[PDB]
Design a protein around this ligand. Structure first.
Ligand SMILES: [Mg+2]
Ligand SMILES: [Mg+2]
Ligand SMILES: [Mg+2]
Ligand SMILES: [Mg+2]
Ligand SMILES: [Mg+2]
Ligand SMILES: [Mg+2]
Ligand SMILES: [Mg+2]
Ligand SMILES: [Mg+2]
Ligand SMILES: [Mg+2]
Ligand SMILES: [Mg+2]
Ligand SMILES: [Mg+2]
Ligand SMILES: [Mg+2]
Ligand SMILES: [Mg+2]
Ligand SMILES: [Mg+2]
Ligand SMILES: [Mg+2]
Ligand SMILES: [Mg+2]
Ligand SMILES: [Mg+2]
Ligand SMILES: [Mg+2]
Ligand SMILES: [Mg+2]
Ligand SMILES: [Mg+2]
Ligand SMILES: [Mg+2]
Ligand SMILES: [Mg+2]
Ligand SMILES: [Mg+2]
Ligand SMILES: [Mg+2]
Ligand SMILES: [Mg+2]
Ligand SMILES: [Mg+2]
Ligand SMILES: [Mg+2]
Ligand SMILES: [Mg+2]
Ligand SMILES: [Mg+2]
Ligand SMILES: [Mg+2]
Ligand SMILES: [Mg+2]
Ligand SMILES: [Mg+2]
Ligand SMILES: [Mg+2]
Ligand SMILES: [Mg+2]
Ligand SMILES: [Mg+2]
Ligand SMILES: [Mg+2]
Ligand SMILES: [Mg+2]
Ligand SMILES: [Mg+2]
Ligand SMILES: [Mg+2]
Ligand SMILES: [Mg+2]
Ligand SMILES: [Mg+2]
Ligand SMILES: [Mg+2]
Ligand SMILES: [Mg+2]
Ligand SMILES: [Mg+2]
Ligand SMILES: [Mg+2]
Ligand SMILES: [Mg+2]
Ligand SMILES: [Mg+2]
Ligand SMILES: [Mg+2]
Ligand SMILES: [Mg+2]
Ligand SMILES: [Mg+2]
Ligand SMILES: [Mg+2]
Ligand SMILES: [Mg+2]
Ligand SMILES: [Mg+2]
Ligand SMILES: [Mg+2]
Ligand SMILES: [Mg+2]
Ligand SMILES: [Mg+2]
Ligand SMILES: [Mg+2]
Ligand SMILES: [Mg+2]
Ligand SMILES: [Mg+2]
Ligand SMILES: [Mg+2]
Ligand SMILES: [Mg+2]
Ligand SMILES: [Mg+2]
Ligand SMILES: [Mg+2]
Ligand SMILES: [Mg+2]
Ligand SMILES: [Mg+2]
Ligand SMILES: [Mg+2]
Ligand SMILES: [Mg+2]
Ligand SMILES: [Mg+2]
Ligand SMILES: [Mg+2]
Ligand SMILES: [Mg+2]
Ligand SMILES: [Mg+2]
Ligand SMILES: [Mg+2]
Ligand SMILES: [Mg+2]
Ligand SMILES: [Mg+2]
Ligand SMILES: [Mg+2]
Ligand SMILES: [Mg+2]
Ligand SMILES: [Mg+2]
Ligand SMILES: [Mg+2]
Ligand SMILES: [Mg+2]
Ligand SMILES: [Mg+2]
Ligand SMILES: [Mg+2]
Ligand SMILES: [Mg+2]
Ligand SMILES: [Mg+2]
Ligand SMILES: [Mg+2]
Ligand SMILES: [Mg+2]
Ligand SMILES: [Mg+2]
Ligand SMILES: [Mg+2]
Ligand SMILES: [Mg+2]
Ligand SMILES: [Mg+2]
Ligand SMILES: [Mg+2]
Ligand SMILES: [Mg+2]
Ligand SMILES: [Mg+2]
Ligand SMILES: [Mg+2]
Ligand SMILES: [Mg+2]
Ligand SMILES: [Mg+2]
Ligand SMILES: [Mg+2]
Ligand SMILES: [Mg+2]
Ligand SMILES: [Mg+2]
Length: 247
RNA sequence: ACGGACCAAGGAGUCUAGCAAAUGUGCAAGUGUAUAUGAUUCUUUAAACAUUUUAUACGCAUAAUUAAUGU
RNA sequence: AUGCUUUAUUGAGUACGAGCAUAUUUGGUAGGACCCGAGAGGCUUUGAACUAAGCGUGAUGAGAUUGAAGUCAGACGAAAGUCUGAUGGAGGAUCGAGUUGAUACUGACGUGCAAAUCGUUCAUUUCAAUCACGUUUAGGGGCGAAAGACUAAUCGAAAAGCCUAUUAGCUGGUUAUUUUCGAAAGAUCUCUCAGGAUCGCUGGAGUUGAUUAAUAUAAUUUUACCAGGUAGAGAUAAUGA
RNA sequence: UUUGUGUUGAAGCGAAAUACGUGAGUUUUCGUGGAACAUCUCCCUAGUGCAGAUCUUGGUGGAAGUAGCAACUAUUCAAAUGAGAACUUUGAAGACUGAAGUGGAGAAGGGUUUCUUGUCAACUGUGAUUGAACAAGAGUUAGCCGCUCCUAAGGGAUAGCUGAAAAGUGUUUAAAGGGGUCCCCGUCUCAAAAGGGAAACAGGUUGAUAUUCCUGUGCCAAUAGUAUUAUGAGUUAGAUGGUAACAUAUAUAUAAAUGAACUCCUUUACAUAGGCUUUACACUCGGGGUGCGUUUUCUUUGCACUUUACCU
RNA sequence: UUUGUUUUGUAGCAAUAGUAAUUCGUAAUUAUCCGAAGUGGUAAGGACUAUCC
RNA sequence: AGCGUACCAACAACCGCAUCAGGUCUCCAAGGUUAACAGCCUCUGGUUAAAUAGAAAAAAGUAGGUAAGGGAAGUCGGCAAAAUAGAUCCGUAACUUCGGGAAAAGGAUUGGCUCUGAGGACAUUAAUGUUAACUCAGAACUGAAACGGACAAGGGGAAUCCGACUGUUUAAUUAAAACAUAGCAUUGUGAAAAGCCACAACUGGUAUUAACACAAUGUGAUUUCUGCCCAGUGCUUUGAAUGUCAACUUGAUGAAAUUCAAUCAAGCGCAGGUAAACGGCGGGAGUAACUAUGACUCUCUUAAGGUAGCCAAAUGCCUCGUCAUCUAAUUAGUGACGCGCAUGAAUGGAUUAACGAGAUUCCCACUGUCCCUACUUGCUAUCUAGCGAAACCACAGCCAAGGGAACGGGCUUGGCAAAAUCAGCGGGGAAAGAAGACCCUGUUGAGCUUUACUCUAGUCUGGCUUUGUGAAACGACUUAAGAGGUGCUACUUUUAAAGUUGUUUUACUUAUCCAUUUAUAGGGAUGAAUUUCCCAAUAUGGAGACAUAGCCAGGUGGGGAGUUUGACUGGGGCGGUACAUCUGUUAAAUAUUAACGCAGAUGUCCAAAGACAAGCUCAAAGAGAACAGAAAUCUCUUGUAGACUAAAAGGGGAAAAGCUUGUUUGAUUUCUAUUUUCAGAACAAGUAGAAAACGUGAAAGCGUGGCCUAUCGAUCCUUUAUAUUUGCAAAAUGACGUAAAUUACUUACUACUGUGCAUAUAGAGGUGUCUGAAAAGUUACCACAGGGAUAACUGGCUUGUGGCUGCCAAGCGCUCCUAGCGACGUAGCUUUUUGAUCCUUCGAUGUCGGCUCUUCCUAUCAUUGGGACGCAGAAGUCUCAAAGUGUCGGAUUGUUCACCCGCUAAUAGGGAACGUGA
RNA sequence: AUUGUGACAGUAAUCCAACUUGGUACGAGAGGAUUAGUUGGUUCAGACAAUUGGUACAGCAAUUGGUUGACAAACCAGUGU
């Protein structure tokens, strides 16, 4: 047989990310003395667009505290921020949209985004456009905070980790029909080489488990086990259930 | 039924190991001078000549049979 | 126990030794093995000047048609709203040169101009558009809007050199004269039925005999003796009609 | 081993014989040839005897003076040269290409095919005096056109870590290297003759080069120390005008309006579609001047020329 | 510092160059190089409007 | 400063083997007509050359043009060609996703010349002057009624099938209904200990990412829908109640090696979920006031019994289904019907405007497709001067028949047969090209698949090491309180003490691992910014002896590797076993003898159905005896086997080989000579005997399985029996046994000597392909060596079947065998049907039908001349000589065949390699 | 060089209609021949061009675009139409 299409992606030759015009990685600010004792405030200079990403980025300027000079950050922007705005980051910053606070000082019900799942991590969890989380519970002895992730899962975090108040901007962009093949050609042109897609039952047996036959059918159960080797896991992977959902 | 338009040159049961039968030769209860060494051997000679100054190198034969101690 | 005894059975055993060395020929075995002949397998290297996909930097598409939202004006109407004229320039919109392709004649040619060309006809031109140079991906691997397609006239596994004079129960060939003898195409076993081993049929060596109109001998008769259930017959004898 | 032939002609080859043998073959004559050749007296030895294998290499036939020498509209008259002109040169005709040209200028690829002179053994599928064939000599000139410098998609390396090595990765805890006077910054190197980017124009000139040569007029970059003269400005440690938007150094030449560490910004620097508008090049009309053409008839007529670069 | 001009200059380069003509012996002269408008083919600049999961 | 600078850029300087009609990237761009850088003509610049020229000019070709009357009658099919086209002014249906359809369909006009009208700017005063530039309307005249005059330039309409649309594809035979697509649905994953994927290892891709994300599948716009089944196969969830399931570990025994036990791994099992997972979704019988039908009922039965829909559909064999319509005539088209061989719901069902170099039917226009051909132009062909190849070639080229390897140029017998040469042509040379690609064979391959055989990367699970420091709690070996029984003894029975060892559960930080940074302040209270108080004196943060890593062990594992997938055979395959055996016959009177010949049997059975002895006589019939009868049990007569003897068939058997009794284990251990098959090998199955111990009978005797002919198995390995026989490579193991003697290394004698293993001899565990390999499929993507030893055509022998012709006379014909016929039976002929066979061809004889063209036959349809009738005439029927002359136009189908509409004089049947593809 | 003989080989014509005979023969009626004659036609064969039609790069005329200054005369657009 021949190596399957999904196996070739791990070599990373024509399947690497398309990133010529991207603007940089979005991080929080590095944890230091100011955000551990008081707070520090930086000024929003511009909201810009990142070619591969749905959400927009804010360009925000802080003033160096250990030397004379200015410093730059790129941060996922929450819906409501404007150019000319001052935001404040630290353990003692007030509760307002756009500030960055430790999650252990937020009351129950607050909507947060751009969260650290470990302290000092510089933000990993809630980042896609239109997404938010919810603070659901606080530990009685401190030290622990409970949140509800966009997928619906519940997760307990260290209570010193940081997050931004508000929701990710540019929300609602999965409600417009794409409606044309060329529109999707332009969409993935700036992401990676994953489109269009030929389906397995239309191939020959050498190159897919679904190939061959005189009638274009699968011929074997399409739910495969978690333990199958690389060239064989191709249908529905370790599915607990199939068919239309009814609840 | 297949190969062959014509002419000249080339073109296919051999070599080595190991066994047997047949036949020629030498000696004969024996037979074969191994590897070496010797010599008034040294164009030929890489051939030929020699054998350690009641005489235990080795092979095959002179005795068979049995899993075997053995006989 | 220095085991004994006629027993019976077995040995490639014994009963006053024949062997060893050496030419040559022939037979069967291994080797390139009488000569020339695969489809394949393995080890190590070369190629993206063609073509496939991604990426960087640049360049290119005569002319014409249609007329979306927005805007100005006029007419109705109690409100809500509705009618007519112009302006405007949207769309994987329409026709069509060039460019990019290849529907039909199942046309020409088919010892071609050409190892895919020529003529007319046809599809396509603001977009999933076309071209150049640079750059990434290398063989059981790559690339594929998917035809087992393409990867230098080579792809249901590229090209180059070695292992290698690989192996073939199968096709083809196998070179001076005269003289003498002269077949088999049955049989047994066989992953055996286009093969092989074994018997039979043939040749060549050698000894023992006969050479005494004898004896041994004979695909022949005669004399003596033996065994048989086919042709014929029977159905009033058995069985079955 | 024996015993023989040859310049008074060996081997080989061609045609033969009142010749021998059942036969394969021996033997001899004449011609050509010009230097070696046998042994049958008996033995030894081998890469030792061809009609074929779509056998191997080389040479030669019938087919046969045959198939054929058909795209791209098309040729004619006279003269020169020459041994010899349908396809070399000159003049006169009739025509084609028709700016999306067999017109001009470059890239990839080629490497002297370029030029002048000579010249025809072979080639230029008919001819050939022609030619990109053959021979002998020549010809390519830059501060301003390019490369060279920058960085891109990317390639190769360093430290470390893997692996027997060959090789694979490329900061993954390097006392990394460099630069601003001791302190700061901080891996190296290559990859674009269409992307970024100091600076030039016109006329003339050769058989063959030209924004490169000649003539004239300009521009850009660089230029160390010491003095001396000259130009100009400023305080007698740094000038003025305007209410403002902002402006001012015109000396051969608008050259000078202080400003260290440290810090911020701008230019380089950027997609597509649609119409409106401006300037330059292009084309056209009517006057003036100059040359040419038609002219039985008509035509104050038909055609050509009437130009002006960078730089200040 | 105000006017039609006393007046020149193709603003300098620049006519000394180029082009089209007419003469003079086997290289020199001389004359011209100037008045008003249309069409929109190509190129570049300007101020704008629109499109993008 | 250094390096480049000539020339070509295709037209002969480049690549294509060449001076090849091919391929190959950028910039400049005039006049006329026009919307136009289109087409046609022209000025500047370039050229007048092409591997040749002259003459002639017929067949045939190739590229073109025209054609009276008809108008698709041609053909599989309107293939090719024709018709239409620019602008302006009118007029436009069904249907529809309201955007379209649309250039729908249709109608009228257009030259030239002479005129009229309408559209701007500027500067002096509603007046006056100076000046453009191209468009658009109207009118009169005019001409062989012509005018987008050349160039350029849509045919349209009514319907059916498929795909929604723009897009993509097999470079060089397939451009599509195939792929893609938006829309819809399902699955996995909260992260540097995560999902999917790469790598030998170290390390990487997605990732400059974070559920509105990345990854893996299916279906394929909109509209309206998406039924029932979790039994099977997959996937997935719970676990010490729970069976099975490794290493390690612990215990018991033993001199030890061993041996025997026990225990919370994952898997499977047990118990659930899931169909927009793979997939599935029934028969029989009766019944309503005429028939017919079956709302209704009864019955078998599944995990569930095909629901909404839809149909002789690109899906229906029968089939050219039945009805209607379209035509003159319809295997075609459309609309209906439905027990549908074998329709059906994201394997998507049913529809659908717009779109398409997609598949089909009809209508108008148009025409040389056709009736039915003719004429004409260029370039070839032709003759000449120059120049000048190749394929192919056993030898060569007239026929008829014969025989022959069954189709001859050569052989036999005949016909005949007279130099040399030019141009055409396609009957033959079973013509050329290529070691047949279909079929079979080979102990020759390869690609692909899987619940074929054997393995393997990856992945999941357990142990040991890496691996340090404290604590607690439950066990278990080591002690003390008992119901009982047992023959002192020998064993379970109640609650803390013993030292150690173990599960498990926590705490610590320094091993180990991860993250962030410029390793930049010890814990609490849309200007510029640089020369306080209290509390204590490993860069930081997060995990932590768990991960990770190394060795070993178990599960899963077509993702991957290697290999296999019998023989016979009226071709192979499917069937069967004729593959190891046995009875009768074919078998031709010794013996042997074939076929997928004929009628059958075998892989067993028996403590007696084996051995011996004695007594007895069987099947059946007749007569007779209470219930008793056709048959119960009793006597008597007759009785050559007509019974019985395990199982096929054949042979044998009467004081027995059969039945009934009595006693028994000869169905026992060892050895020879030999018969059957046959090589005169094995196995196996038999015959005659010898040595030993026994049974039976009074005894002579008989007995080594079954009255005779079938009833079965090598090497290697394993397993139990036998022995006064052996071994384990320098030696010993009963035993210092028995006698002496010591002052010890003393002397002599003996059949009998550790665990475990090996070995000799005998039986058993099995190979049925039976003289004995551990073995699944597919190839329509295909390879190689061969085969006319072997299939798919023509030809050859045969003639069952197919077709045609005879003989006899029951009966038909009102009557009457034979005008015309002829049942029950019988003899032939032909090779225009289909079979049977396998002789020729597999280093190749082109495989259906039509079109075209010639010739042959007669078994005569018409035309010529006759005979007979159940013959008035007319019209016909049977038959003789006879092959001279004819034997058509169309609708449907690829058709041969068939069927219908027509005309005719009649619309006969056949052959020539199933005549005829250079 | 003219005119001839002619062995042998090839060979060619075919079928139909109407009318008269005749509403006759025959027949109860209904119906209704043969044969011969006349005038035409189908298929085939061998020629031919007075008439009709087809054909055009003899010829004459008309005309679109372009080009010679105009008229006249012409030419190009592979045969412009
Ligand atoms: Mg496919
Ligand atoms: Mg597979
Ligand atoms: Mg499908
Ligand atoms: Mg052969
Ligand atoms: Mg041949
Ligand atoms: Mg030779
Ligand atoms: Mg000898
Ligand atoms: Mg060989
Ligand atoms: Mg192999
Ligand atoms: Mg390339
Ligand atoms: Mg590319
Ligand atoms: Mg379009
Ligand atoms: Mg073509
Ligand atoms: Mg063709
Ligand atoms: Mg396929
Ligand atoms: Mg070989
Ligand atoms: Mg003889
Ligand atoms: Mg053979
Ligand atoms: Mg007998
Ligand atoms: Mg008889
Ligand atoms: Mg000699
Ligand atoms: Mg000499
Ligand atoms: Mg030889
Ligand atoms: Mg030869
Ligand atoms: Mg010729
Ligand atoms: Mg020439
Ligand atoms: Mg032309
Ligand atoms: Mg021209
Ligand atoms: Mg043009
Ligand atoms: Mg030259
Ligand atoms: Mg020259
Ligand atoms: Mg020549
Ligand atoms: Mg030269
Ligand atoms: Mg420069
Ligand atoms: Mg880079
Ligand atoms: Mg560089
Ligand atoms: Mg540049
Ligand atoms: Mg030059
Ligand atoms: Mg130069
Ligand atoms: Mg040059
Ligand atoms: Mg080459
Ligand atoms: Mg060329
Ligand atoms: Mg040429
Ligand atoms: Mg012609
Ligand atoms: Mg005409
Ligand atoms: Mg006509
Ligand atoms: Mg028809
Ligand atoms: Mg027809
Ligand atoms: Mg057509
Ligand atoms: Mg329509
Ligand atoms: Mg489509
Ligand atoms: Mg399309
Ligand atoms: Mg193709
Ligand atoms: Mg095609
Ligand atoms: Mg599809
Ligand atoms: Mg999809
Ligand atoms: Mg659909
Ligand atoms: Mg289930
Ligand atoms: Mg378990
Ligand atoms: Mg199925
Ligand atoms: Mg139904
Ligand atoms: Mg239908
Ligand atoms: Mg029809
Ligand atoms: Mg079904
Ligand atoms: Mg369903
Ligand atoms: Mg289905
Ligand atoms: Mg010619
Ligand atoms: Mg030749
Ligand atoms: Mg013949
Ligand atoms: Mg022949
Ligand atoms: Mg003859
Ligand atoms: Mg022929
Ligand atoms: Mg073959
Ligand atoms: Mg072959
Ligand atoms: Mg294989
Ligand atoms: Mg496999
Ligand atoms: Mg077979
Ligand atoms: Mg006999
Ligand atoms: Mg008897
Ligand atoms: Mg008895
Ligand atoms: Mg018995
Ligand atoms: Mg066998
Ligand atoms: Mg056998
Ligand atoms: Mg296979
Ligand atoms: Mg045969
Ligand atoms: Mg017959
Ligand atoms: Mg042949
Ligand atoms: Mg052939
Ligand atoms: Mg043939
Ligand atoms: Mg008749
Ligand atoms: Mg008849
Ligand atoms: Mg035929
Ligand atoms: Mg026949
Ligand atoms: Mg053909
Ligand atoms: Mg045919
Ligand atoms: Mg033929
Ligand atoms: Mg006429
Ligand atoms: Mg005429």
């Amino acid at each position: 047989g021949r190596v399957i299409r999904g196996q070739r992606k791990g070599r990373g030759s024509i399947f690497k990310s398309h990133n010529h015009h991207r603007k940089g990685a979005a991080k929080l600010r590095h944890l230091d003395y100011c955000e551990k004792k008081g707070y520090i405030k930086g000024l929003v200079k511009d909201i810009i667009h990142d070619p591969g990403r749905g959400a927009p980025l804010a360009k925000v300027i802080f003033k160096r505290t250990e030397k004379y000079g200015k410093k730059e950050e790129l941060i996922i922007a929450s819906e409501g921020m404007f150019t000319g705005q001052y935001i404040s980051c630290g353990t003692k910053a007030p509760l307002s949209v756009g500030n960055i606070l430790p999650i252990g000082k937020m009351p129950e019900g607050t909507l947060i985004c751009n969260l650290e799942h470990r302290t000092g991590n510089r933000g990993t969890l809630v980042k896609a456009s239109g997404c938010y989380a919810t603070v659901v519970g606080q530990s009685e002895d401190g030290k622990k905070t409970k949140v509800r992730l966009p997928s619906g899962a519940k997760k307990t975090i260290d209570a010193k980790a940081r997050a931004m108040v508000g929701v990710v901007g540019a929300g609602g962009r999965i409600d417009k029909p794409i409606l044309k093949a060329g529109v999707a050609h332009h969409k993935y042109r700036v992401k990676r080489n994953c489109w269009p897609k030929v389906r397995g039952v239309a191939m020959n047996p050498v190159e897919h488990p679904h190939g061959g036959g005189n009638h274009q059918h699968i011929g074997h159960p399409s739910t495969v086990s978690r333990s199958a080797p690389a060239g064989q896991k191709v249908g529905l992977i370790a599915a607990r259930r199939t068919g239309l959902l009814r609840g």
